[PDB]
């Protein structure tokens, strides 16, 4: 291997191999009357394990248990969606289970997790929410405290051992009333909770009215209302607080500051305690992970936790190219772009002012200068508020070669931001917004806006230098909406990624992308590749955001086989990688950690040293390229994103683009894009 080896710890710990009594659980038969449904079988079975108590988990059509029947509720009744059933338990003996059997250890692990939860529940000082355990005050001030602990997990190996996973976690508690909060000179909190339950509101403002006068819609006093429900006992109804249901922060609602509790944010506490942060440097996290594991191991009698370690590899650093070698995409602004054509940009200024700020103009002129390309700056002399007549000014501008517009504006409300983007999109004019209290020293902001204005005009700002197996990299993502999704793709064409493009996403019902929409989108990207290279890709790299639904690529993969195109399919999850810590030395991004076959972690970005990185977990779902070669290419593709300028995304450019793309479309809609080139990244 030409890559440097390193050892790492995962945040997992190996514990004892299971004993006899743990492998052979009390089995049981479940007789539900009225007999269950079909979509309601498992859900009711599980609600029976919780209703039976003890270390019980469902197994097939019944349940397994690490508890004696003599402490199990064998006769009872639970009410599901409409129907009221009655259960009865029949001890079907005590059969042994098999750690190798995938779906059997699913039960063993299930029980392990249940064991862990009950042992924790009986501990005195600790607070336990699900699998998170908080055990120690970590910080505190007047009225608030932060508890420290860790979310945990206990599962069973294929090889019959217990596995403990630990990751440090914090909980912020505020226990003072809003009245007291404000009386001690603190600022208004954006959100606020009921003192008598969990209902939490957004806090609009304080009221000048009197509680005992504030007439409650249909009845009595603001105060008398609350008094009625006995909420003033051992409390003081304070002043009037106007709040709003966060789902529709319009209609204001009367409340008492004596009965609201602030919900605090890390910054409301960094104001008090100061220098208090909830993210950890990786070495502090590693230390605390080890401490916590040892703490629990000692309350658990499953052996001494032995931190599991893996072999990691430092991947080669990507050589990023502008017109000349660059180290981040913003440097292309100084050196020149990878490939700049003739381009024309327009300005729409929506403060009271007029004309291109000279420093932006010069920055642009310099950038095109270094690149040896022509630039023609235009200025829209029309206002969005001129209604339909505005459109004639936009059409005029596109009919003069304008490829994108810079919008100089005061901060716009989200509604108006979308309204405007859309409005310019109708005329095939992608837009970059730049907020207008703006000063030349605010450099990272306007230089990023510039990088975006250029991607939106179709310029390729950077490309890779290197040899990769795949000449086409395409990433697939689903949806930028709640009750339905989108599903689209973005594209790194050429082995250098010399071109980036997107494809119009297609509305769908859930996560799963219709088998044929997958192949459709893929075909779009192959035709893109063909008219750039005059030929078909010899090999493609296929990437999905998140899990890959069962054979949703099956149809697309056979079509590729038909056409004689080679391929790999990788699933890229943002969660589920846990943590990775060097045993010795620094940790730099570019970290590759093989796990099982067809799977590995990739530490793609490390940069904000006050926080701990979260590795991507990747699964090799189809194809037979060496894991390490996939890792190498994914990693480098990380560096290809044009619109970030000063920091690389954690995701490979195509998956990061696909994400951004389905989010934009879910926000703006699918209309107004017929006249927007697919090389113009309108959505960055």
Partner DNA sequence: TGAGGTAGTAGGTTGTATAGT
Q: Which residues within the stretch 654-673 sit at the binding site for RNA (CB under 7 A)? A: 659, 663
Task: Looking at residues 230 to 259 of the shown chain, list those that interact with DNA (rule: CB under 7 A).
Answer: none
The reply on whether position 641 binds DNA by CB under 7 A is yes
Residues 6+ apart with CB under 8 A from 544: 475, 476, 477, 553, 569, 570, 571, 572, 621, 655
The reply on whether position 608 binds RNA by CB under 7 A is yes
**β-pair partners for 134:** 127, 149
Q: The tokens of 579 are what?
A: 């943590």
Nearer Cβ to RNA, position 191 or 539?
A: 191
Which one of DNA, RNA, none interacts with residue 344, CB within 5 to 8 A by kind?
A: none
Query: According to CB under 7 A, which one of 636, 650, 678, 680 is a site residue for DNA?
Result: 650
Measured distance CA(501)–CA(513) in Å, rounded: 20
* Number of other residues whose CB lies within 10 A of the CB of residue 191: 15
Name the segment binding DNA (CB under 7 A); options: 65-73, 91-99, 202-210, 278-286. 278-286
| Residues 472 and 540 sit within 8 Å (Cβ to Cβ) | yes
Strands (E), 531-606: 539-545, 566-573, 580-582, 591-594, 599-603
Provide, rounded to whole angstroms, the least separation between the CB of residue 574 and DNA. 8
The reply on whether position 608 binds DNA by CB under 7 A is yes
Query: According to CB under 7 A, which one of 96, 142, 411, 576 is a site residue for DNA?
Result: 411
Each residue 133-172 as x (binds DNA by CB under 7 A) or -, in order, gives -----------------------------------xxxxx
Which one of RNA, DNA, none interacts with residue 539, CB within 5 to 8 A by kind?
A: none
* Phi, psi at 519, each rounded to 5°: -65, -35
* Phi, psi at 83, each rounded to 5°: -90, 145
The reply on whether position 643 binds DNA by CB under 7 A is yes
* Phi, psi at 125, each rounded to 5°: -75, -15
Strands (E), 33-123: 56-59, 62-65, 75-79, 84-90
Each residue 470-509 as x (binds DNA by CB under 7 A) or -, in order, gives ------------xx-------------------------x
Nearer Cβ to RNA, position 43 or 594?
A: 43
Query: According to CB under 7 A, which one of 107, 154, 263, 461 is a site residue for DNA?
Result: 263
Q: How many residues bind DNA (CB under 7 A)?
A: 73
Q: Is 46 helix (H, G, I), strand (E, B) or coil?
A: helix
Each residue 560-589 as x (binds RNA by CB under 7 A) or -, in order, gives -------------xxxx-------------
The reply on whether position 644 binds DNA by CB under 7 A is yes
Q: The tokens of 317 are what?
A: 């650093």
Each residue 180-199 as x (binds RNA by CB under 7 A) or -, in order, gives ----------xx--------
Query: According to CB under 7 A, which one of 75, 248, 267, 399 is a site residue for RNA?
Result: 267
Measured distance CA(209)–CA(216) in Å, rounded: 12
Provide, rounded to whole angstroms, the least separation between the CB of residue 221 and DNA. 25
Provide, rounded to whole angstroms, the least separation between the CB of residue 190 and RNA. 4
Element (H, E) at 489: strand 488-493
Query: According to CB under 7 A, which one of 140, 314, 339, 445 is a site residue for DNA?
Result: 445
* Number of other residues whose CB lies within 10 A of the CB of residue 610: 9
Q: How far is CA 348 from CA 251, 342, 430, 435, 670, in A?
A: 35, 21, 12, 12, 24
Query: According to CB under 7 A, which one of 184, 265, 327, 341 is a site residue for DNA?
Result: 265
The reply on whether position 555 binds RNA by CB under 7 A is no
**β-pair partners for 617:** 573, 601
Name the segment binding DNA (CB under 7 A); options: 72-80, 197-205, 306-314, 589-597. 197-205
The reply on whether position 248 binds RNA by CB under 7 A is no
Distance of CA 463 to the CA centre of its chain: 26
Name the segment binding DNA (CB under 7 A); options: 90-98, 155-163, 222-230, 446-454. 446-454
Name the segment binding RNA (CB under 7 A); options: 72-80, 400-408, 539-547, 551-559. 539-547
The reply on whether position 295 binds RNA by CB under 7 A is no
Provide, rounded to whole angstroms, the least separation between the CB of residue 574 and RNA. 4
Query: According to CB under 7 A, which one of 195, 204, 220, 266 is a site residue for DNA?
Result: 266
Q: What's the burial of 197, exposed, middle or buried (CB within 10 Å: 0-12/13-18/19+)?
A: exposed
SS (H, E, C) 327-375: CCHHHHHHHCCCECCCEEEEEEECCCCCCCCHHHHHHHHHHHHHHCCCE
Provide, rounded to whole angstroms, the least separation between the CB of residue 181 and RNA. 16
Measured distance CA(441)–CA(238) in Å, rounded: 46
The reply on whether position 617 binds RNA by CB under 7 A is yes
Provide, rounded to whole angstroms, the least separation between the CB of residue 372 and RNA. 27
Measured distance CA(464)–CA(323) in Å, rounded: 11
Nearer Cβ to DNA, position 124 or 267?
A: 267
In this structure, what is the dihedral angle of CA atoms 223, 225, 228, 234, given to the nearest 10 degrees? -40
Provide, rounded to whole angstroms, the least separation between the CB of residue 563 and DNA. 26
Task: Looking at residues 138 to 167 of the shown chain, list those that interact with RNA (rule: CB under 7 A).
Answer: 153
Task: Looking at residues 507 to 536 of the shown chain, list those that interact with DNA (rule: CB under 7 A).
Answer: 509-512
What's the alpha-carbon Rg for the chain, to the nearest Å?
30
Task: Looking at residues 412 to 431 of the shown chain, list those that interact with RNA (rule: CB under 7 A).
Answer: 412, 417
Which one of DNA, RNA, none interacts with residue 545, CB within 5 to 8 A by kind?
A: RNA
Which one of RNA, DNA, none interacts with residue 573, CB within 5 to 8 A by kind?
A: RNA
Task: Looking at residues 61 to 90 of the shown chain, list those that interact with DNA (rule: CB under 7 A).
Answer: 61
Residue length of the chain: 684
Measured distance CA(312)–CA(314) in Å, rounded: 7
User: Does the CA dihedral 246-252-256-258 come out positive or negative?
Assistant: positive
Measured distance CA(514)–CA(510) in Å, rounded: 10
Residues forming the site for RNA (CB under 7 A): 42-43, 46, 113, 130-131, 153, 190-191, 202, 246, 265-267, 270, 411-412, 417, 435, 444, 480, 482, 545-547, 573-576, 607-608, 610, 617, 646-647, 659, 663
């Amino acid at each position: 291997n030409h890559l440097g080896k390193t050892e790492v710890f995962l945040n997992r710990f190996a514990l004892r191999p299971l004993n006899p009594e743990e492998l052979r659980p009390w089995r049981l038969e479940v007789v539900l009357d009225p007999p269950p449904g079909r979509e309601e079988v498992y859900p009711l079975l599980a609600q029976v394990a919780r209703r039976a108590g003890g270390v019980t988990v469902r197994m097939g059509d019944g349940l397994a248990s690490w508890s004696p029947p003599e402490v199990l509720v064998l006769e009872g009744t639970l009410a599901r969606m409409g129907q009221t059933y009655a259960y009865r338990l029949y001890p079907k003996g005590r059969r042994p289970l098999d750690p190798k059997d995938p779906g059997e250890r699913s039960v063993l692990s299930a029980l392990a997790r249940r064991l862990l939860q009950e042992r924790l529940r009986r501990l005195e000082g600790v607070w336990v929410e699900g699998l998170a355990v908080y055990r120690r005050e970590h910080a505190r001030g007047p009225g608030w405290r932060v508890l420290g602990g860790a979310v945990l997990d206990l599962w069973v190996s294929d090889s019959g051992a217990f596995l403990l996973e630990v990751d440090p976690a914090y909980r912020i508690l505020c226990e003072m009333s809003l009245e007291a909060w404000l009386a001690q000179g603190h600022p208004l909190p954006k959100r606020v909770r009921n003192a008598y339950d969990r209902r939490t509101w957004e806090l609009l403002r304080l009221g000048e009215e009197d509680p005992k006068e504030l007439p409650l819609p249909g009845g009595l006093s603001l105060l008398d209302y609350h008094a009625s429900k006995g909420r003033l006992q051992g409390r003081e109804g304070g002043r009037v607080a106007w709040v709003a249901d966060p789902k529709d922060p319009r209609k204001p609602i009367p409340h008492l500051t004596g009965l609201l509790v602030p919900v605090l944010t890390l910054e409301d506490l960094h104001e008090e305690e100061g220098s208090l942060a909830l993210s950890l440097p990786w070495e502090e996290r590693r230390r605390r992970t080890r401490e916590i594991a040892s703490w629990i191991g000692r309350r658990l009698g499953l052996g001494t936790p032995e931190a599991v370690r893996a072999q990691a590899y430092r991947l080669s650093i990507p050589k990023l190219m502008g017109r000349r070698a660059v180290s981040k995409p913003a440097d292309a602004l100084r050196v020149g772009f990878y490939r700049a054509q003739e381009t024309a940009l327009a300005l729409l200024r929506l403060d009271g002012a007029q004309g291109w700020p000279e420093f932006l103009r010069r920055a642009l002129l310099r950038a095109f200068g270094a690149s040896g390309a022509s630039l023609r700056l235009h200025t829209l002399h029309a206002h969005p508020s001129q209604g339909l007549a505005f459109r004639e000014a936009l059409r005029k501008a596109k009919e003069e070669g304008v490829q994108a517009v810079l919008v100089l504006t005061p901060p716009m409300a989200w509604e108006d931001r979308n309204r405007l983007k859309a409005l310019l999109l109708r005329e095939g004019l992608p837009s970059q917004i730049l907020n207008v209290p703006l000063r030349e020293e605010e450099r990272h902001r306007w230089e990023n806006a510039l990088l975006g204005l250029l991607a939106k005009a179709g310029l390729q700002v950077v490309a890779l230098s290197g040899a990769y197996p795949a000449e086409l990299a395409v990433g697939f993502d689903a949806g930028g909406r709640e009750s339905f999704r989108f599903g689209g793709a973005a594209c790194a064409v050429g082995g250098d990624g010399g071109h980036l493009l997107w494809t119009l996403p297609e509305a769908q019902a859930g996560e799963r992308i219709p088998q044929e929409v997958v192949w459709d989108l893929l075909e779009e990207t192959l035709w893109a590749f063909r008219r750039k290279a005059g030929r078909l890709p010899s090999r493609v790299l296929l990437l999905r955001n998140g899990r890959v639904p069962q054979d949703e690529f099956a149809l697309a993969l056979e079509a590729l086989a038909r056409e004689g195109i080679a391929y790999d399919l990788v699933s890229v999850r943002k969660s589920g990688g846990g943590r990775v810590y060097p045993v010795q030395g620094r940790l730099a991004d570019g970290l590759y950690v093989p796990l099982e076959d067809k799977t590995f972690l990739l530490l793609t970005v490390h940069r904000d040293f006050r926080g701990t990185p979260r590795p991507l977990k990747l699964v090799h779902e189809a194809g037979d390229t060496p894991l390490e070669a996939l890792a190498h290419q994914i990693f480098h593709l990380t560096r290809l994103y044009p619109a970030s300028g000063f920091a690389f995304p954690r995701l490979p450019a195509p998956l990061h683009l696909a994400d951004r793309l389905v989010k934009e479309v879910g926000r703006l809609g699918i209309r107004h894009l017929k006249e927007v080139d697919r090389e113009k990244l309108f959505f960055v």
